[PDB]
PDB file of C-alpha atoms in Angstrom:
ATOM      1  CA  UNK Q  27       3.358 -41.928  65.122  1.00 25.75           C
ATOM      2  CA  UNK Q  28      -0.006 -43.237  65.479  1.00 24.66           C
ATOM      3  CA  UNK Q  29      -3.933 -40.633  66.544  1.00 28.37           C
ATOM      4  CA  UNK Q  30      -6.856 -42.568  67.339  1.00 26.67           C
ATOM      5  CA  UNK Q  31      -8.815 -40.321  68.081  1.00 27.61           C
ATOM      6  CA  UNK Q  32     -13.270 -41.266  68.572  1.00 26.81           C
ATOM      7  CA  UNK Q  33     -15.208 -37.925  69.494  1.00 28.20           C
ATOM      8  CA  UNK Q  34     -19.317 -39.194  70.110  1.00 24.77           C
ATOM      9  CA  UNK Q  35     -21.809 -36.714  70.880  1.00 25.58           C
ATOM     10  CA  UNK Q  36     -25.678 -36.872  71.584  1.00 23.73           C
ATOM     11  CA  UNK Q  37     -28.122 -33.967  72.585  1.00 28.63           C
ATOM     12  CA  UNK Q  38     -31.130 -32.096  71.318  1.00 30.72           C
ATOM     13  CA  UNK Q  39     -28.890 -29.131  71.069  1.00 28.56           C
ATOM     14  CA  UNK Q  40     -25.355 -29.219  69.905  1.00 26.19           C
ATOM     15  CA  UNK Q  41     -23.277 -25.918  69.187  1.00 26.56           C
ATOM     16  CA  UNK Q  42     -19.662 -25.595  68.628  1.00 27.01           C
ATOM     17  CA  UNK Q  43     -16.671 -22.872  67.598  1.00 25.54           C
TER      18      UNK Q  43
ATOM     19  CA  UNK W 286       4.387 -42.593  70.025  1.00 27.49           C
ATOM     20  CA  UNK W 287       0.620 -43.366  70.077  1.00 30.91           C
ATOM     21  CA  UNK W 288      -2.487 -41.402  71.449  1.00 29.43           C
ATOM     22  CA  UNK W 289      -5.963 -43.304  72.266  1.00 30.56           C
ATOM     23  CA  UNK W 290      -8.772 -40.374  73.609  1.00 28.31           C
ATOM     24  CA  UNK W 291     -11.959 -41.390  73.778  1.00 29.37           C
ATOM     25  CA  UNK W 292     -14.735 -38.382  74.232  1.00 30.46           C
ATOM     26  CA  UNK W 293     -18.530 -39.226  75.041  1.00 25.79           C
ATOM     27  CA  UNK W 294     -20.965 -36.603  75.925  1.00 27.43           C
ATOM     28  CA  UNK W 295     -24.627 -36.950  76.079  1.00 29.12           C
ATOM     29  CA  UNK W 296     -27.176 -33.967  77.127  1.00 28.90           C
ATOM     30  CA  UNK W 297     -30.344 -32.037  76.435  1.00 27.75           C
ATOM     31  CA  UNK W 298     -28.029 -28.731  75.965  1.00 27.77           C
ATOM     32  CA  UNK W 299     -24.230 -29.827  74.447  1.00 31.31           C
ATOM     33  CA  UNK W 300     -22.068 -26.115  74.167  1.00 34.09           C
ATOM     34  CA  UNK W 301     -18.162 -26.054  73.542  1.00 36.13           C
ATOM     35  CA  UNK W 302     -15.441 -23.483  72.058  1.00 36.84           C
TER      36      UNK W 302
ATOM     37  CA  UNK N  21       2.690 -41.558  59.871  1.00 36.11           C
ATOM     38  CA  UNK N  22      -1.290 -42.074  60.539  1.00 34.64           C
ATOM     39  CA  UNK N  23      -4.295 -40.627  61.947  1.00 33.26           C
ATOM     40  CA  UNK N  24      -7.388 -42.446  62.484  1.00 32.44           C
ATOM     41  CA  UNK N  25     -10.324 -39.946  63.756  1.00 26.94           C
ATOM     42  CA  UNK N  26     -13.617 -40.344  64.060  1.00 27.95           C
ATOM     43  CA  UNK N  27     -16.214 -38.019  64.495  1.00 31.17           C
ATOM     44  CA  UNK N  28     -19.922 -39.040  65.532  1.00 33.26           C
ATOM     45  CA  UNK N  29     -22.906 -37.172  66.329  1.00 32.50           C
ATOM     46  CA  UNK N  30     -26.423 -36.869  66.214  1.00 32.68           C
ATOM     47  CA  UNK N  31     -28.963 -33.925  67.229  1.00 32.49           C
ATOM     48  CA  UNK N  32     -32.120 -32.445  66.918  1.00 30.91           C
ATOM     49  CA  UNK N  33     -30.094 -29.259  66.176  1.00 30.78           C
ATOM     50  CA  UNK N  34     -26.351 -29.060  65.316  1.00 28.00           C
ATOM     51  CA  UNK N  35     -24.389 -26.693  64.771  1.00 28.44           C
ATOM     52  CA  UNK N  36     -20.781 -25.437  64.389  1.00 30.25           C
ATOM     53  CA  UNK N  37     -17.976 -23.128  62.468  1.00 29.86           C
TER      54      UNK N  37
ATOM     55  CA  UNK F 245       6.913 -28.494  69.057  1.00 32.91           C
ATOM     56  CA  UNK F 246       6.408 -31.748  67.643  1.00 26.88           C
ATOM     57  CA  UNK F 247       3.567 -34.885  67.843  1.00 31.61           C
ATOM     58  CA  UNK F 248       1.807 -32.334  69.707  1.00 31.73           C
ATOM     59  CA  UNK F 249      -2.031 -31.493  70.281  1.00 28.33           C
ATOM     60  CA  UNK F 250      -2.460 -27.979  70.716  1.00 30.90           C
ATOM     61  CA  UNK F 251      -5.799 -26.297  72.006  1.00 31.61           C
ATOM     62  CA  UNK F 252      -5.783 -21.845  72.186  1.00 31.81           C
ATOM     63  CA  UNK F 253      -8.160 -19.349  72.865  1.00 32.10           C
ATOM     64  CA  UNK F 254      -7.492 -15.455  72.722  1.00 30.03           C
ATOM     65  CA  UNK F 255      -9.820 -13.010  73.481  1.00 27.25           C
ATOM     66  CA  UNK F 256     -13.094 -11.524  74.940  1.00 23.82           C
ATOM     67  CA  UNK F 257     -15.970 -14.587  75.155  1.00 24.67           C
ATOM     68  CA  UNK F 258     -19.085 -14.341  76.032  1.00 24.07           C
ATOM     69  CA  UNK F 259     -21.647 -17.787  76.279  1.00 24.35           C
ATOM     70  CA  UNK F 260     -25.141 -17.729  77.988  1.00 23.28           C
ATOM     71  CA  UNK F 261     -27.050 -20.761  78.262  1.00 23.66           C
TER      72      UNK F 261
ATOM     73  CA  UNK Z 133       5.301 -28.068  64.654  1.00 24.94           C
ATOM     74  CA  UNK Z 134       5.117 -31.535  62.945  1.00 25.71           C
ATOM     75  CA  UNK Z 135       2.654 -34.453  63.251  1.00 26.75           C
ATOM     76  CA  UNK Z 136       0.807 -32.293  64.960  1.00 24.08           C
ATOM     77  CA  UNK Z 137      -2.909 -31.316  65.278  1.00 23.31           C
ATOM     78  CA  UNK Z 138      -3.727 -27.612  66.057  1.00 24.97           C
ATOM     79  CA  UNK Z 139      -6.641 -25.450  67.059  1.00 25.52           C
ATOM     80  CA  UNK Z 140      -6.819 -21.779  67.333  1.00 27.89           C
ATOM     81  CA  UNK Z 141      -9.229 -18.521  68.412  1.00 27.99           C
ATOM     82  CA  UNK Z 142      -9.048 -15.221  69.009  1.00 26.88           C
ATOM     83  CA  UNK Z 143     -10.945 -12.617  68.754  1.00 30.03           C
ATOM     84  CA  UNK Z 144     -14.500 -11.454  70.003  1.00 28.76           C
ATOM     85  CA  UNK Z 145     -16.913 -14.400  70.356  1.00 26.52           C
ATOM     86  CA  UNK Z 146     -21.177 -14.642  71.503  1.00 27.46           C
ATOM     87  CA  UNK Z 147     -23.337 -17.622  72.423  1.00 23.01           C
ATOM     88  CA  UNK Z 148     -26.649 -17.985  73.329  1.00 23.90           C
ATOM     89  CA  UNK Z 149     -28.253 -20.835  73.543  1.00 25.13           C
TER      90      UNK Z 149
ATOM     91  CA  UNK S 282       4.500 -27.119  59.188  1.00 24.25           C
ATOM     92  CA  UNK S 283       4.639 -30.916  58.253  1.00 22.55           C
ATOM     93  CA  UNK S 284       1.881 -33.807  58.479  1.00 19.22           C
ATOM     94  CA  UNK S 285      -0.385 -31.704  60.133  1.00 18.81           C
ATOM     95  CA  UNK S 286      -4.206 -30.841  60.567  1.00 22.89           C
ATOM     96  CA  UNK S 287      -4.568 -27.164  61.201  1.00 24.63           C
ATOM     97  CA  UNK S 288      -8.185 -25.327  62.060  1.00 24.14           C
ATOM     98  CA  UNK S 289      -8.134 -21.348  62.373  1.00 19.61           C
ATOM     99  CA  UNK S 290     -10.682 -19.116  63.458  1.00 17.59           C
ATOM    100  CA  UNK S 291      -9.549 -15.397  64.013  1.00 18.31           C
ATOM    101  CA  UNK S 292     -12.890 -12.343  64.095  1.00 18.07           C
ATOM    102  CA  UNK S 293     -16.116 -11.117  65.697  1.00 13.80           C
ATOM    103  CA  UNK S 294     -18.570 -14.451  65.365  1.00 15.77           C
ATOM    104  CA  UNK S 295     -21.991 -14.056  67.055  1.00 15.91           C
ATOM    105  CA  UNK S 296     -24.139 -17.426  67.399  1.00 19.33           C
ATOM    106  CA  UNK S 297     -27.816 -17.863  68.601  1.00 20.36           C
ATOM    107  CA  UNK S 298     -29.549 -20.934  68.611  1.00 21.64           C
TER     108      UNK S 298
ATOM    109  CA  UNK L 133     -22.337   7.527  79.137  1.00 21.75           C
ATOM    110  CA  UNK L 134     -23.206  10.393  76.924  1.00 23.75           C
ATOM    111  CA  UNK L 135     -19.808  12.113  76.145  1.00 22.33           C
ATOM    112  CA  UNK L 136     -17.441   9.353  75.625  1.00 23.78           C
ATOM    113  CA  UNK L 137     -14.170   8.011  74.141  1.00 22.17           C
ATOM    114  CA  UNK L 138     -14.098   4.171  74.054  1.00 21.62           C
ATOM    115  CA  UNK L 139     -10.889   2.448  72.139  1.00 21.29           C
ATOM    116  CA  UNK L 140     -10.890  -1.829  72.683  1.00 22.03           C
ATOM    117  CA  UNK L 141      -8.504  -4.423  71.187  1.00 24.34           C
ATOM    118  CA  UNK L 142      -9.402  -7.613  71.690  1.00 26.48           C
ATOM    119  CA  UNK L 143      -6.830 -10.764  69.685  1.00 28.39           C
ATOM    120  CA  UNK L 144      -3.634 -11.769  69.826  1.00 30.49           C
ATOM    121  CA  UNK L 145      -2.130  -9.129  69.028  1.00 31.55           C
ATOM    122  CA  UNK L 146       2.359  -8.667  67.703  1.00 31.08           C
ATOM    123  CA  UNK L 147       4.581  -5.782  67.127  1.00 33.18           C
ATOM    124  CA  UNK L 148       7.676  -6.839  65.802  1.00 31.46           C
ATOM    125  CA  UNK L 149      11.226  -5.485  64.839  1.00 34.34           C
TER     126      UNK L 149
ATOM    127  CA  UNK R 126     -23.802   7.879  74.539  1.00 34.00           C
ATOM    128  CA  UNK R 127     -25.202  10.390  72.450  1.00 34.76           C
ATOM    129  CA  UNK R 128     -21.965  12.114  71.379  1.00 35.39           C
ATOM    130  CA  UNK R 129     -18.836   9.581  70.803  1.00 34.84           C
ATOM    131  CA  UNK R 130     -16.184   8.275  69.415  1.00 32.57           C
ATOM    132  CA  UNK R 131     -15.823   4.270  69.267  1.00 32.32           C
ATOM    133  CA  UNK R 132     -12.854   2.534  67.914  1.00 31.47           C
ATOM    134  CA  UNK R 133     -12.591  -1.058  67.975  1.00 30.97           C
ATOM    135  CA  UNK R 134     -10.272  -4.337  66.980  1.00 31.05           C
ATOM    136  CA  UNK R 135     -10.295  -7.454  66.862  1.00 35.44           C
ATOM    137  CA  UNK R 136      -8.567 -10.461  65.139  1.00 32.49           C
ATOM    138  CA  UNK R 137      -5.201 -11.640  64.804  1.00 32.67           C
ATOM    139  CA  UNK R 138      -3.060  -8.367  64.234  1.00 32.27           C
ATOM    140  CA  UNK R 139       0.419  -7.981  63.242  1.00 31.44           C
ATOM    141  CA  UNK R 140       2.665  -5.037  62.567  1.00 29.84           C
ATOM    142  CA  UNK R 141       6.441  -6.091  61.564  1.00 35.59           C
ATOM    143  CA  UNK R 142       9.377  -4.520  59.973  1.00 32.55           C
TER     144      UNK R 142
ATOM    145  CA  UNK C 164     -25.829   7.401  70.041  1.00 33.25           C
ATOM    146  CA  UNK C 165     -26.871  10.938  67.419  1.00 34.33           C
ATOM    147  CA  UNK C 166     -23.704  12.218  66.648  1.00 33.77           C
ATOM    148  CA  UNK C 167     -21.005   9.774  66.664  1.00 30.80           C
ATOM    149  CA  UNK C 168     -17.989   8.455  64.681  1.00 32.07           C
ATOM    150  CA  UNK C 169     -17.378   4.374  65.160  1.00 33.76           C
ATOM    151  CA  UNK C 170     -14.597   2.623  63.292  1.00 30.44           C
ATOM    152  CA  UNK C 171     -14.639  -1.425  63.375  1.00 30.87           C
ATOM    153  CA  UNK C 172     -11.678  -3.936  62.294  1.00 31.18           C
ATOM    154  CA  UNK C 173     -12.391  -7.446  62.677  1.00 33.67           C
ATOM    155  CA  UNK C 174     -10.210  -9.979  60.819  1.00 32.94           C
ATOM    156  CA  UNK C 175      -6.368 -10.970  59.457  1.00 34.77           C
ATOM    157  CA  UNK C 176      -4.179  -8.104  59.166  1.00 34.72           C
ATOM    158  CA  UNK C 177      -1.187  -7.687  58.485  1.00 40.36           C
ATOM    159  CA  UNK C 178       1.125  -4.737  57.601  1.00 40.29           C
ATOM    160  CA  UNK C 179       4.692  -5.500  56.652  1.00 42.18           C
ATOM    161  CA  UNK C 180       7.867  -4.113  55.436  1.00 43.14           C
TER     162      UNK C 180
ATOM    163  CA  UNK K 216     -16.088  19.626  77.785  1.00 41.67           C
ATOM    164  CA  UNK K 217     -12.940  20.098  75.707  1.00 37.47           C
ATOM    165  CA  UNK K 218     -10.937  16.696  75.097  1.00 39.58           C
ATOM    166  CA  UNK K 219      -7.769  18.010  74.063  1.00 41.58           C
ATOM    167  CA  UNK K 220      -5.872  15.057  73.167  1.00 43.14           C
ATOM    168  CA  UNK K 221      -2.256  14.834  71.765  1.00 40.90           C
ATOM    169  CA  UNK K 222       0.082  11.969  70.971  1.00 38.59           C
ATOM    170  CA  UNK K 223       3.354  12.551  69.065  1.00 40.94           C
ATOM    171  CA  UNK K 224       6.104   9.574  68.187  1.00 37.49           C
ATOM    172  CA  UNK K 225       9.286   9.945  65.956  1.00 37.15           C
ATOM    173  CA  UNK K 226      12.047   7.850  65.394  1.00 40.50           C
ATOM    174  CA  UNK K 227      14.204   6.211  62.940  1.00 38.45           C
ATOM    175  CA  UNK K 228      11.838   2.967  62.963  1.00 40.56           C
ATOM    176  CA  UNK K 229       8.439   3.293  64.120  1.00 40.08           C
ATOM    177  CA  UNK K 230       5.638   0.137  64.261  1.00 38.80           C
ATOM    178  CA  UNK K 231       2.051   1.301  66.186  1.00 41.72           C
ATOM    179  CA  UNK K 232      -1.082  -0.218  66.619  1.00 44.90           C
TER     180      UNK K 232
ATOM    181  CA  UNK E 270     -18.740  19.675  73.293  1.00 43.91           C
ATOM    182  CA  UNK E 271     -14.964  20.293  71.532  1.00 44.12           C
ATOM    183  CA  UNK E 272     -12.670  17.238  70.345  1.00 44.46           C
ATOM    184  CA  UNK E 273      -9.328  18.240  69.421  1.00 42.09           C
ATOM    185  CA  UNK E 274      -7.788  15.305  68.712  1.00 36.44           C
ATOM    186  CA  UNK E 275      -4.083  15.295  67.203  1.00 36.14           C
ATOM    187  CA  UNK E 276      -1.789  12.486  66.260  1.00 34.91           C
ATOM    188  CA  UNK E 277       1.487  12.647  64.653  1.00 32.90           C
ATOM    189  CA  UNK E 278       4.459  10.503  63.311  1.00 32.18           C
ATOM    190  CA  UNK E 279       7.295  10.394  61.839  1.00 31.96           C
ATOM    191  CA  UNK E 280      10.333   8.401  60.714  1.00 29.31           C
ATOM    192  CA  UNK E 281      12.968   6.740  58.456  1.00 30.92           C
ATOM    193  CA  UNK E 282      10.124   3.837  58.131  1.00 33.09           C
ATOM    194  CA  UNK E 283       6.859   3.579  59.369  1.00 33.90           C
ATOM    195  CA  UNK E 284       4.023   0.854  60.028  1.00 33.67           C
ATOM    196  CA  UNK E 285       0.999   1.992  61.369  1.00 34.54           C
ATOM    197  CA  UNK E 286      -2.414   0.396  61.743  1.00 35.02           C
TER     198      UNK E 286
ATOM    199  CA  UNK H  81     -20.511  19.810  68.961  1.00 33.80           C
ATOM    200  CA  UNK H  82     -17.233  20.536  66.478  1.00 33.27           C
ATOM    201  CA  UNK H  83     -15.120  17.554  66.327  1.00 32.78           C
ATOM    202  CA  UNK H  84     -11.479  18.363  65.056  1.00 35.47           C
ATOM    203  CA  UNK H  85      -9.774  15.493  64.222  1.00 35.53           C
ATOM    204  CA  UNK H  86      -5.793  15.687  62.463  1.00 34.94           C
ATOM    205  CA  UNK H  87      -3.626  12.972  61.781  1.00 32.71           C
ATOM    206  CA  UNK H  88      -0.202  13.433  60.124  1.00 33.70           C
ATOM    207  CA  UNK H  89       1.981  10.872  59.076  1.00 32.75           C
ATOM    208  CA  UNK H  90       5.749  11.341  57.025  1.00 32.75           C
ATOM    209  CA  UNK H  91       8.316   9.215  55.769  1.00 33.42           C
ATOM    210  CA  UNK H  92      10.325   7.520  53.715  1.00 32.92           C
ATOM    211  CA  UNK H  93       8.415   4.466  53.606  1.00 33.03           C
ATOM    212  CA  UNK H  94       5.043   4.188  55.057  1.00 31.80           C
ATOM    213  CA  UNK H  95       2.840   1.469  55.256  1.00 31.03           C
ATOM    214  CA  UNK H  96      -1.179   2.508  56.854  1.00 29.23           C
ATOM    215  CA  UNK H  97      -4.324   0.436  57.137  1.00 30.78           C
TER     216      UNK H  97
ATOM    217  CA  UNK J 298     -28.656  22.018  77.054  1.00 29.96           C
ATOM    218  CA  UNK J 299     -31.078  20.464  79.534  1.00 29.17           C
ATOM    219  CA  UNK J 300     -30.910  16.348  79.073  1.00 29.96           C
ATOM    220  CA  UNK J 301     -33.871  13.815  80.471  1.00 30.15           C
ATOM    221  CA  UNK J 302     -33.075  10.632  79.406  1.00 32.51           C
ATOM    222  CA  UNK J 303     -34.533   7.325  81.175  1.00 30.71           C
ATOM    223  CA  UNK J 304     -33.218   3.731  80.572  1.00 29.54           C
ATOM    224  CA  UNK J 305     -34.530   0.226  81.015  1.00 27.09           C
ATOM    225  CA  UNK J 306     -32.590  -2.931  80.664  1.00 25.70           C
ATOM    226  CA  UNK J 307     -33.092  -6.590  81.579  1.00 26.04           C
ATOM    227  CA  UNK J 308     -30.889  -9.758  80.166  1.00 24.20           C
ATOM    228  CA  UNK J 309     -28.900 -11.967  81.708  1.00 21.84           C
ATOM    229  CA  UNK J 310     -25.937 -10.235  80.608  1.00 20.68           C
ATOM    230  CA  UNK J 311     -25.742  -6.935  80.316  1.00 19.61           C
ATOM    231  CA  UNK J 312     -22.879  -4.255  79.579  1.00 18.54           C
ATOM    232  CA  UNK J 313     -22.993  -0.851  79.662  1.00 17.48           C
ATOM    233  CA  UNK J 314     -21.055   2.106  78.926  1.00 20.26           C
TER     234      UNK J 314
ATOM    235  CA  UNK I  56     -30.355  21.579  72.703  1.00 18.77           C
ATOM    236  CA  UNK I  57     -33.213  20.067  74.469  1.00 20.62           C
ATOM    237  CA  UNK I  58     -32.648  15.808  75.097  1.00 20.27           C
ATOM    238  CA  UNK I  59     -35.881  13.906  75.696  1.00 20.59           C
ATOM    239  CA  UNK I  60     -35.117  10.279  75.510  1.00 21.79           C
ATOM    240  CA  UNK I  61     -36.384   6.888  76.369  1.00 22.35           C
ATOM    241  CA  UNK I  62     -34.815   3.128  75.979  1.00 21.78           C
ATOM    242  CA  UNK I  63     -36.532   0.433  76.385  1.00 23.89           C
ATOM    243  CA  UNK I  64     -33.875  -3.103  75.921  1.00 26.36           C
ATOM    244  CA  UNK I  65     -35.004  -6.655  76.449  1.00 25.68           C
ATOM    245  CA  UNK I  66     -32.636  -9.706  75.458  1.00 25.45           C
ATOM    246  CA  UNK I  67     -30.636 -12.828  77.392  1.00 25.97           C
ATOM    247  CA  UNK I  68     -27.465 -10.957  75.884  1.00 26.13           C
ATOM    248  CA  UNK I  69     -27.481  -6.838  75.498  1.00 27.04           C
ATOM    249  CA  UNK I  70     -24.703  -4.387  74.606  1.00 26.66           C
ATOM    250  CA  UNK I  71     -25.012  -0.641  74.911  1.00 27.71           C
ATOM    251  CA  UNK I  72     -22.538   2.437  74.415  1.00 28.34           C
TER     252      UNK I  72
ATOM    253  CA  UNK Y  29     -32.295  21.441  68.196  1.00 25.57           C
ATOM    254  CA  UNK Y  30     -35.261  19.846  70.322  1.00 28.01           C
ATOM    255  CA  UNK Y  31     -34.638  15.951  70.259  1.00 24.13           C
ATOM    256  CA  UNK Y  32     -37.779  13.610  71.286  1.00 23.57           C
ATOM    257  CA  UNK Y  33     -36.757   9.614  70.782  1.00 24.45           C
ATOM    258  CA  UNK Y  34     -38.533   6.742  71.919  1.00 27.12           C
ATOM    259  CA  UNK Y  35     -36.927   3.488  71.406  1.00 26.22           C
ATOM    260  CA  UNK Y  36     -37.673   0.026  71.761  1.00 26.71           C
ATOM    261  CA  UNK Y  37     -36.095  -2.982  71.348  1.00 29.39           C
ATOM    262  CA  UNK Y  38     -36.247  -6.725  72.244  1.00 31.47           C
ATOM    263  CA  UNK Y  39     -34.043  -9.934  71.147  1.00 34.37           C
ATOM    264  CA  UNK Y  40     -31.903 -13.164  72.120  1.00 37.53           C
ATOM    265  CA  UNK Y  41     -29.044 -10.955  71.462  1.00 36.67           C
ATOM    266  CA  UNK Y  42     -28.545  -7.407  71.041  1.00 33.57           C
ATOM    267  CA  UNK Y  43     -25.859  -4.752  70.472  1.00 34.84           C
ATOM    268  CA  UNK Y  44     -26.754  -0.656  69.904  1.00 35.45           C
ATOM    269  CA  UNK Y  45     -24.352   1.964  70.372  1.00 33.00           C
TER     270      UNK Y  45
ATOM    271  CA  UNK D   3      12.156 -41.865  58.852  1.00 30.24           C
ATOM    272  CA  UNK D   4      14.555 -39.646  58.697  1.00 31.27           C
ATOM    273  CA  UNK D   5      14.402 -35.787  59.100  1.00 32.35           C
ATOM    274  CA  UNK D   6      16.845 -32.673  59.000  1.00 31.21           C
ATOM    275  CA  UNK D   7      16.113 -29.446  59.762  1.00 32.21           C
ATOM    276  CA  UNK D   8      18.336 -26.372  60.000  1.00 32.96           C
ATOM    277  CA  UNK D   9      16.997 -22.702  60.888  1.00 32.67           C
ATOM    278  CA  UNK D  10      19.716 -20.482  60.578  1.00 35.53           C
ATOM    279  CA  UNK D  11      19.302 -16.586  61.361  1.00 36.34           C
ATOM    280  CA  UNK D  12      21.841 -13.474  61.677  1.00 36.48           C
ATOM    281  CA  UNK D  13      21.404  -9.541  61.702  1.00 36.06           C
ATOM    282  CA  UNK D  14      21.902  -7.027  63.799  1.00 33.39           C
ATOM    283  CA  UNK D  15      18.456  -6.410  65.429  1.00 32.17           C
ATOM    284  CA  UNK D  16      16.535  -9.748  65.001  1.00 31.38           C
ATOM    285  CA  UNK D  17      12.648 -11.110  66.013  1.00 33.86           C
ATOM    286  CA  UNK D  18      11.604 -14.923  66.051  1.00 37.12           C
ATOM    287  CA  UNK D  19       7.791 -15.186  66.681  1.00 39.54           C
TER     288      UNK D  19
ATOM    289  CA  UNK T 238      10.974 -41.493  53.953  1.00 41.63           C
ATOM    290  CA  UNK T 239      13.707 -38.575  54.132  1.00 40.61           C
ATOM    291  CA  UNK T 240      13.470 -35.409  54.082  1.00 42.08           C
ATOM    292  CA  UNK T 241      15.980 -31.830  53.941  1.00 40.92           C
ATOM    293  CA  UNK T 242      14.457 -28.562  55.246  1.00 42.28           C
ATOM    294  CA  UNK T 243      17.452 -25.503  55.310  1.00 39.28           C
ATOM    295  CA  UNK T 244      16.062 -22.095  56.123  1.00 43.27           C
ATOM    296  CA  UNK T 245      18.400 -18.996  56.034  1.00 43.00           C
ATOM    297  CA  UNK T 246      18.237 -15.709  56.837  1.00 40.83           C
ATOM    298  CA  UNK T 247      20.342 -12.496  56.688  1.00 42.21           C
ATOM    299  CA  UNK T 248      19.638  -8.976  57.356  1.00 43.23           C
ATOM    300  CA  UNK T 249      20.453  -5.550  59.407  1.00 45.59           C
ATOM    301  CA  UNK T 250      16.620  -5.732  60.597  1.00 47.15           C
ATOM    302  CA  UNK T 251      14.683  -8.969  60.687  1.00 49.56           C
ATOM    303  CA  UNK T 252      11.593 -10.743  61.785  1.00 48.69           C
ATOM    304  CA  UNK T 253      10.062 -14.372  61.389  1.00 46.89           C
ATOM    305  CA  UNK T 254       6.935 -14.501  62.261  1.00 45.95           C
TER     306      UNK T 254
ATOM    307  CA  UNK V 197      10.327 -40.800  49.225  1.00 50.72           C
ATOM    308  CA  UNK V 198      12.880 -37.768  49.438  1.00 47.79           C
ATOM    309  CA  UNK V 199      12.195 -34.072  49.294  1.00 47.59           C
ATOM    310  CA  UNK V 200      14.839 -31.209  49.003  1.00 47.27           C
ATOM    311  CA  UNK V 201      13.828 -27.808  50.130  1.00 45.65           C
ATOM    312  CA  UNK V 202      16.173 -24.561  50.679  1.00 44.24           C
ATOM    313  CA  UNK V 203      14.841 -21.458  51.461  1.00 42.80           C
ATOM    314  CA  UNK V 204      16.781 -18.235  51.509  1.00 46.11           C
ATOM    315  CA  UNK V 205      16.345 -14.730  51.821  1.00 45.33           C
ATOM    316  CA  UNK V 206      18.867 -11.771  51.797  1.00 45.62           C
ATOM    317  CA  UNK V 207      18.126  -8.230  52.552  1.00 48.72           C
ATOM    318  CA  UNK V 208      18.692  -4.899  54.802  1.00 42.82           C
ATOM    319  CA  UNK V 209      14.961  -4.965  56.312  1.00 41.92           C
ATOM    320  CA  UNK V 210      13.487  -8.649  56.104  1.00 37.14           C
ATOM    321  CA  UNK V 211       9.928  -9.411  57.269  1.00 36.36           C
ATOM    322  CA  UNK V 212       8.909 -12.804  57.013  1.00 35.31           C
ATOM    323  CA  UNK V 213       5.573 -14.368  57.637  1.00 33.82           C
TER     324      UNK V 213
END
């Protein structure tokens, strides 16, 4: 069992939940 | 078992849930 | 068992919950 | 449910932009 | 649920932006 | 619920940005 | 509306035996 | 509304016996 | 709304025998 | 205007919401 | 404007929410 | 504008919120 | 009784009862 | 009684009972 | 008894009941 | 790696969630 | 790596939730 | 590594959660 997981974010505005 | 995600995002206005 | 995440971003405003 | 990614949303949303 | 990753919401949610 | 990341939200949530 | 009767549920909602 | 009754939920609700 | 009655829940409940 | 409004249950076991 | 509002239960065992 | 309101709950065991 | 009543609403979302 | 009333709402995101 | 209301209101979001 | 698991349930009225 | 997990249940009425 | 778990529960009414 193996996650590689890379999330990349850019903006002037950033919202999330 | 093995997971590779890649997410790139790029934006004047970045909104999720 | 293994996780390898990464999490990147960058923003004139960020936000989340 | 195993070596599973799991996403959910319930309810009453609401997102202007 | 094992070697798993899991997200949840429910409920009443508002975003402006 | 073994080797596991777990992220619960559950309400009223109200964001403005 | 001036007379009213509101009721709202709004989740994940479980009635169990 | 002027005159009312308002009655509201919202979450994650269980009821179990 | 003058004259009113309003009754919120928002959250984890639970109610268990 | 009248609202007459009834709502009876009865039984051994009883869960409402 | 009346509101004659009537709510009954009963049982052995009761949840109620 | 009267507002008569009854609630009535019996039973061996009761559990309310 | 005698009611005047005048509303005025503008938003991109709107919900009304 | 005698009901003289004005509303005056402005907003990207309104709710009204 | 004689009622005279004026209300005003402005915002990104809003909720009134 | 090596795992057991038993889930073992009886009665006469029964609920798995 | 080994691991046991027994779960056991026994009842007139049940619920796993 | 080794883990040993047991779990058990016994009843007339049983809520588990």
């Amino acid at each position: 069992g193996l996650f590689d997981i890379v999330k990349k974010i850019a903006g002037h505005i950033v919202s999330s939940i």
